[PDB]
């Protein structure tokens, strides 16, 4: 728009509760796909995501699985004759580190909400939390 | 319209063997242990006898859901292998590539 | 000149120092109230202008998931605690105190504690088939010098 | 002699799309997967549900538009909305799509219980990548 | 047959409702306004006191309660267009920057009528405010519907 632009958007409203916030030692992100070329770019956008909210993030490629079986290639006898068949498994793991639980919400939505089709996430949330107040002191 | 007659009677077996199965689980419970006395294992031995045959599970079979062939199906998609063939030749499945190796 | 909160008002009414005295819900909702929210809603209603606005008519809808995911959202197991499915062994006290049938409602109740595919109404309900089927074999049980209830 | 989802050659007159042109060897190589979801990946579930939907939605898109389809339609699953990508030719007029859009997304949301839209991208005739 | 005992029957109504303790709301006020459209000219002096006594009972004005005054103060069919009011000016100060949410069955009718009126003042200053109104917010939401959305 050259002339006509919106004056005063509305923004959501955010209200800071009284309970403490999660702490999240470690966030482990392991995303999963058929093709590498969309982790790259998911890894991309998560990575630049990450940096711009001030998140500390880290990346690395497990090794990657691939799962293969044989059929019967005719439907009538000729068993000597096969065909194999595979599915390719590809992984990405953003490591996120030192996250409370607003930060953790807001981004998982983020990235979760633009999770490209063929794409599955398996989020590792680590919390530290302190002992439970009977355990801090011996009681017989 | 199921596919055939043989898939209208495992349906109906299936359907059978869930109503049963809390049944059929405490009273095989009672049998397969050697705390109870075996007057009572021998007992609950007939109780399990008399349920109708069609709720015992092991007379499921299973068959593609869209031809109802009783052999050469896959457990991951419930398909024989030439149905499974023809929608992976295709690029129909999701992820299903040949094997070139 | 013509200002327009500056001048002469009626005055019929007055300042309203109690205000909303009577509660917005006086009664449960009428015909006639619930249809006047709804034509209100239409005042407003506008058609789609983007996708983001698509998504949150479908989450307010319950259509689409919410987001971050929660894998049971929705599902809670009769607002149960751990403790309800883990420690059944009150339910077992219809049963004899000791005995053959003690041990075997311990492995029972023992199994029942490890499922998580079962409520704890459920988790009962195996336990009080137990205890009628042994009500019904007393007299089989008691030739096996076992006494139930 | 293999005859699996292979367009076989006529006499140079035969139009063929590119989808068809490729033999099954060349999916992941030359050509994708008409649909993506997650179930066929390593540790997921509903596999055979996923796959039945979408034998069920092609045939569904192909009676609802006879004859109007230039293509395969492409279906894509995020989270639990689905997306049917069809290649339409212009043969209907344009407020006849309106209202098979309208029934056909309604009906297959109240169906399979998810959010479901439809995109059809216009062609003025079926694209032909060879001649075979 | 007499709009001064019209008038004050109608006054009778909300005395009433002063006796048996009842407040009154929104509609109660847009219902009057809308009423007082017939009679242009005389419901002017009228229709501003009912608005000064909106803000003194507490009840905000909405869009709807605008769009009644101006209809009563810029008639579509005037023939005195050579000394037109300034209430438009005025109302648009008040309103410069407030958001508003759907409180009546003629919020929508308001943005479609108040650029009407600037067409025929020929005031482009006024109608980017009344644009500039629309674009705050949500306010968006309020143009109008199929007829008065390409009417505007
Ligand atoms: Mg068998």
Same mark, same amino acid.
């Given at each position: 728009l050259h002339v006509d632009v919106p004056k005063d958007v @509305?923004?959501?409203?955010?209200?800071?509760?009284?309970?403490?916030? @999660?702490?999240?030692?470690?966030?482990?992100?392991?995303?999963?796909?058929?093709?590498?070329?969309?982790?790259?770019?998911?890894?991309?956008?998560?990575?630049?995501?990450?940096?711009?909210?001030?998140?500390?993030?880290?990346?690395?490629?497990?090794?990657?699985?691939?799962?293969?079986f044989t059929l019967l290639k005719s439907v009538h006898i000729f068993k000597k004759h096969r065909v194999q068949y595979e599915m390719r498994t590809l992984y990405r793991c953003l490591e996120l580190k030192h996250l409370t639980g607003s930060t953790a919400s807001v981004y998982l939505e983020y990235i979760q909400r633009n999770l490209p089709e063929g794409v599955a996430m398996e989020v @590792?949330?680590?919390?530290?939390?302190?002992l439970p107040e009977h355990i801090k002191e011996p009681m017989w | 319209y199921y596919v055939d007659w043989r898939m209208l009677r495992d349906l109906k077996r299936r359907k059978m063997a869930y109503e049963y199965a809390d049944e059929r689980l405490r009273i095989n419970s009672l049998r397969k242990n050697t705390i109870l006395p075996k007057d009572l294992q021998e007992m609950a031995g007939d109780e399990i006898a008399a349920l109708p045959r069609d709720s015992c599970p092991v007379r499921i079979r299973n068959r593609c859901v869209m031809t109802s062939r009783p052999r050469g199906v896959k457990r991951r998609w419930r398909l024989s292998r030439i149905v499974f063939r023809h929608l992976a030749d295709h690029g129909l499945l999701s992820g299903v590539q040949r094997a070139i190796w | 000149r013509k200002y327009l909160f500056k001048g002469k008002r009626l005055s019929i009414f007055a300042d309203k120092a109690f205000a909303d005295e009577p509660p917005e819900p006086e009664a449960s909702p009428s015909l006639w109230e619930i249809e006047f929210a709804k034509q209100l809603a239409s005042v407003a209603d506008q058609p789609f202008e983007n996708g983001f606005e698509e998504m949150i008519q479908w989450?307010?809808?319950?259509?689409?998931?919410?987001?971050?995911?929660?894998?049971?959202? +929705?599902?809670?197991?009769?607002?149960?605690?751990?403790?309800?499915?883990?420690?059944?062994?009150?339910?077992?006290?219809?049963?004899?105190?000791? +005995?053959?049938?003690?041990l075997f409602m311990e492995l029972v109740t023992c199994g029942l504690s490890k499922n998580p595919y079962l409520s704890v109404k459920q988790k009962v309900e195996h336990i009080e088939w137990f205890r009628n089927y042994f009500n019904e074999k007393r007299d089989i049980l008691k030739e096996n010098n076992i006494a139930f209830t | 002699?293999?005859?699996?989802?292979?367009?076989?050659?006529?006499? $140079?007159?035969?139009?063929?799309?590119?989808?068809?042109?490729?033999?099954? /060897?060349?999916?992941? /190589?030359?050509? $994708?997967?008409?649909?993506? /979801?997650? $179930?066929?990946?390593? $540790?997921?579930?509903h596999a055979a549900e996923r796959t039945l939907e979408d034998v069920f939605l092609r045939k569904f898109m192909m009676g609802t538009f006879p004859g109007c389809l230039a293509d395969q339609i492409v279906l894509k699953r995020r989270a639990n909305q689905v997306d049917i990508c069809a290649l339409v030719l212009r043969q209907l007029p344009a407020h006849k799509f309106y209202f098979l859009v309208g029934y056909s997304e309604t009906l297959l949301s109240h169906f399979y219980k998810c959010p479901v839209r439809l995109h059809l991208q216009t062609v003025p005739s079926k694209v032909v990548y060879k001649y075979i | 047959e007499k709009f001064e005992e019209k008038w004050n029957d109608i006054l009778d109504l909300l005395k009433h409702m002063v006796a048996q303790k009842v407040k009154p709301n929104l509609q109660t006020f847009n219902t009057i306004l809308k009423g007082l459209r017939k009679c242009y000219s005389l419901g002017r002096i009228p229709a501003l006191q009912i608005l000064r006594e909106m803000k003194h009972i507490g009840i905000e004005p909405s869009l709807a309660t605008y769009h009644h005054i101006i209809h009563l103060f810029?008639?579509?069919?005037?023939?005195?267009? !050579?000394?037109?009011?300034?209430?438009?000016?005025?109302?648009?100060?008040?309103?410069?920057?407030?958001?508003?949410?759907?409180?009546?069955?003629?919020?929508?009718?308001?943005?479609?009528?108040?650029?009407?009126?600037?067409?025929?003042?020929?005031?482009?200053?006024?109608?980017?405010?009344?644009?500039?109104?629309?674009?705050?917010?949500?306010?968006?939401?309020?143009?109008?519907?199929?007829?008065?959305? !390409?009417?505007?």
């Open positions: @509305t923004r959501p409203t955010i209200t800071t509760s009284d309970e403490p916030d @999660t702490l999240y030692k470690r966030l482990s992100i392991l995303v999963k796909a058929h093709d590498r070329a969309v982790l790259d770019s998911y890894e991309y956008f998560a990575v630049l995501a990450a940096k711009e909210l001030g998140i500390s993030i880290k990346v690395h490629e497990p090794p990657r699985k691939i799962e293969r @590792t949330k680590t919390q530290i939390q302190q | - | 989450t307010k809808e319950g259509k689409l998931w919410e987001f971050p995911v929660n894998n049971e959202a +929705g599902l809670d197991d009769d607002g149960s605690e751990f403790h309800e499915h883990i420690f059944l062994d009150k339910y077992l006290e219809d049963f004899p105190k000791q +005995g053959p049938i003690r | 002699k293999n005859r699996a989802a292979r367009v076989r050659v006529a006499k $140079g007159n035969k139009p063929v799309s590119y989808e068809e042109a490729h033999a099954p /060897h060349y999916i992941a /190589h030359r050509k $994708g997967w008409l649909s993506l /979801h997650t $179930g066929n990946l390593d $540790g997921e579930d | 810029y008639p579509r069919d005037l023939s005195a267009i !050579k000394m037109p009011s300034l209430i438009i000016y005025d109302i648009m100060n008040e309103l410069e920057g407030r958001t508003f949410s759907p409180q009546d069955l003629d919020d929508g009718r308001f943005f479609q009528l108040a650029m009407s009126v600037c067409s025929s003042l020929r005031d482009l200053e006024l109608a980017y405010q009344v644009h500039r109104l629309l674009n705050t917010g949500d306010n968006r939401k309020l143009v109008g519907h199929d007829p008065l959305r !390409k009417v505007y």
